[PDB]
Every structure is written in C-alpha cells, then in structure tokens.
C-alpha cells in the first residue's frame, strides 16, 4: 500500500492533502504557468541555438521543447502540489475558502 504522508510535512496550512491530478494541475497559478513557460522557452531557445551548428535547428528545437515541456510542467506541478499540500507558501487558500 501507499500513503502520501511526508517527512517534514505540513509546514504550511494544507489545502488538500494528496491532490488528485487534473486538480493540482488545474491549480496552476499565473506564476506556475509563468514558470512552465519560461522553462519551455529557455529549453526551446537552447534547443534551437544548440542545433545551429549541425543543421538541426528545427528538430533540435522541437526536442528541446519536449524536454522543456516535461521539465517545466513537472516544476509547475511541484509548485502547485507543494502549494495545495502543506509544503510551500500556499497563499491559494482563498480558492478553498471561496469555493
């Protein structure tokens, strides 16, 4: 069996312990969507720029964008999860007190 109980947990007020996917991703603040967007840019820009030499600018840009999507999305997920769970600043408790 599994349990999301954590070490050093709940340092901030938890909003929803063990957030379900499609909710923790629907919790993306305009900062997360701005972290998932800058990582995908620095990963497309490096991916295209690295590929200027071997002639692969387009496809290396695409694979840098794939890496950036995966990484920046897992980072936005880390943030919105440690926010929904009690791990991060978590000023999005108004979303629970209002809904």
């Amino acid at each position: 069996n599994t349990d999301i109980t954590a070490l050093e947990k709940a340092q901030y007020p938890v909003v929803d312990r063990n957030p379900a996917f499609t909710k923790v991703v629907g919790n993306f603040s305009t900062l997360d969507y701005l972290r998932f967007s800058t990582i995908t840019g620095i990963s497309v820009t490096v991916g295209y720029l690295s590929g200027i030499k071997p002639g692969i600018k387009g496809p290396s840009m695409v694979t840098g964008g794939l890496i950036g999507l995966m990484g920046g999305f897992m980072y936005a997920y880390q943030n919105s999860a440690g926010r929904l769970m009690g791990f991060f600043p978590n000023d999005g408790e108004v979303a629970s007190y209002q809904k």
């Binding site: 701005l34 995908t40 497309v44 820009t45």
Partner: peptide, 27 residues
C-alpha cells in the same frame, strides 16, 4: 521581409524566457 523559418520561433522563445525571468521575481 523575415529571416529563416524557425529562427523567428527561437527569437520569440528568448523574449518569453526573459519575460519569465522578470516575471519570476514579479510573481
């Protein structure tokens, strides 16, 4: 009146990455 296809995408991406850096401090 434009450069090679794909160079434009990288130039746009750099602005969106730089916007994110100022934004990360802002938000």
């Amino acid at each position: 009146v434009s450069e090679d296809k794909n160079r434009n995408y990288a130039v746009v991406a750099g602005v969106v990455a730089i916007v994110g850096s100022i934004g990360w401090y802002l938000k």
